[PDB]
Amino acid sequence: APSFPFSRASGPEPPAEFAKLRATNPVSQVKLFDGSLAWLVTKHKDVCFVATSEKLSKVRTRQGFPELSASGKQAAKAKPTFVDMDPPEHMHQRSMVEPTFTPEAVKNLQPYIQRTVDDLLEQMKQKGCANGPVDLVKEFALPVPSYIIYTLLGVPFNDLEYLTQQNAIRTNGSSTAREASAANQELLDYLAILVEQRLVEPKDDIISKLCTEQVKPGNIDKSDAVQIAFLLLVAGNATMVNMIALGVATLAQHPDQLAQLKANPSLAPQFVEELCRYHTASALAIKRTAKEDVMIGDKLVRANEGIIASNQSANRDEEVFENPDEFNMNRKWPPQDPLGFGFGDHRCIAEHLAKAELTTVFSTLYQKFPDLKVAVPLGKINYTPLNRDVGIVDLPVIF
Ligand code: HEM
Numbered sequence: 514a515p516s517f518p519f520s521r522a523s524g525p526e527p528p529a530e531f532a533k534l535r536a537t538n539p540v541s542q543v544k545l546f547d548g549s550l551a552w553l554v555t556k557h558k559d560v561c562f563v564a565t566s567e568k569l570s571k572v573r574t575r576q577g578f579p580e581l582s583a584s585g586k587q588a589a590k591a592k593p594t595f596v597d598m599d600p601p602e603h604m605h606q607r608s609m610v611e612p613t614f615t616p617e618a619v620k621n622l623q624p625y626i627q628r629t630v631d632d633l634l635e636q637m638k639q640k641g642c643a644n645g646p647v648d649l650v651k652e653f654a655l656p657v658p659s660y661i662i663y664t665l666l667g668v669p670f671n672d673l674e675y676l677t678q679q680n681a682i683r684t685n686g687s688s689t690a691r692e693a694s695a696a697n698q699e700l701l702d703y704l705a706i707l708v709e710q711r712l713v714e715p716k717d718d719i720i721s722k723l724c725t726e727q728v729k730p731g732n733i734d735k736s737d738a739v740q741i742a743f744l745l746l747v748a749g750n751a752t753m754v755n756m757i758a759l760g761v762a763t764l765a766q767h768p769d770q771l772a773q774l775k776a777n778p779s780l781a782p783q784f785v786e787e788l789c790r791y792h793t794a795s796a797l798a799i800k801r802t803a804k805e806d807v808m809i810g811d812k813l814v815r816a817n818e819g820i821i822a823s824n825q826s827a828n829r830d831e832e833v834f835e836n837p838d839e840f841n842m843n844r845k846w847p848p849q850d851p852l853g854f855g856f857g858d859h860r861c862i863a864e865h866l867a868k869a870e871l872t873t874v875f876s877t878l879y880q881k882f883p884d885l886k887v888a889v890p891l892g893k894i895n896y897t898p899l900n901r902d903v904g905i906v907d908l909p910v911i912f
Contacts, residue, residue: 667718755904
């Protein structure tokens with residue numbers, strides 16, 4: 514069995530292994546860092562099955578759970594939040610924070626999302642690029658999602674820049690382990706103060722709702738409120754940053770589609786749909802252990818065996834998505850959902866928010882900056898390391 518995770522074939526490409534597995538070995542065993550095994554599931558139909566089967570568990574205290582790194586094994590010791598829960602605990606906790614993220618809530622947030630994007634673009638414009646390129650990541654792709662989720666959580670405006678920087682340190686490839694861990698605990702300590710404050714004087718934010726609706730009645734404790742808030746911050750932010758950067762790069766890669774998007778910003782939703790399929794920037798989250806034997810395709814997954822269901826591979830499944838390796842914002846979509854946000858009850862809580870952020874970016878960026886260009890050759894883009902999820906570290910631009 515080959516070692517997993519696999520490395521991407523090149524900066525912007527999926528691992529090469531998946532297409533071969535879909536063709537000849539769609540349910541197969543891989544070897545994890547600890548020498549254990551796990552079943553890797555590569556076809557769309559089977560990924561959806563894994564994501565929804567009640568015979569499979571997300572609880573990380575089950576032997577067989579496919580931890581992919583030493584750090585993941587460590588992390589599984591803590592008290593879980595809803596990301597790692599099964600029913601009925603899962604929705605009991607997730608429903609505490611769902612309201613902000615519903616389709617209707619996100620539609621009503623659109624003016625705020627637009628204003629946030631607009632303001633960050635105007636700052637660019639004012640900073641300019643007269644002395645040479647600026648980094649679209651630092652100036653734009655990072656602060657857009659960060660400012661939004663911090664604001665929704667309850668962070669006041671004057672603390673956004675510093676906290677945006679500190680959360681980036683958690684995941685920056687250049688951070689040492691000490692720097693990343695110190696930033697993690699710094700953010701937790703910060704959120705703990707905000708919970709104390711909002712318990713005394715609630716405001717218009719997610720932490721206040723946790724405090725009033727869950728902490729005060731005794732349904733959760735203050736520490737639980739901190740960890741739920743922290744999950745909402747860290748689960749998606751680095752993925753959002755990467756998706757923005759990858760979208761800009763992809764448009765540059767495919768000039769005629771950029772021309773189409775400038776000419777018609779109403780194409781932004783379908784651009785974003787294609788982006789979230791083609792660049793599956795969170796590919797390692799659909800993991801389970803079997804609670805009892807389960808058949809998947811021509812394989813038997815025995816009780817206490819682990820499963821990794823690749824939504825990245827599902828999103829390139831030729832049986833579902835015709836010409837899957839073509840980026841086509843005018844794609845004729847099938848009935849089956851793309852899986853950029855997962856599937857089933859655990860499907861990304863923030864899918865509607867994330868798509869609204871991305872649609873706002875891609876309907877606005879090239880109206881603001883019709884001459885935006887990546888300022889290095891596309892083949893020189895600095896992608897995330899190939900043994901990680903797809904992403905872009907920095908992206909020099911002019912405009
Ligand atoms: C384009 C950006 C994003 C992508 C592609 C993405 C993708 C995903 C994926 C693949 C999962 C796993 C779902 C499953 O288990 O089937 C997930 C879960 C989750 N995401 Fe996102 N995410 C994004 C942005 C966000 C944002 C902005 C937030 C928070 C504000 C967020 C919060 C979460 C949470 C809390 C979960 C766990 C849900 C659960 O297990 O019940 N995500 N996301």
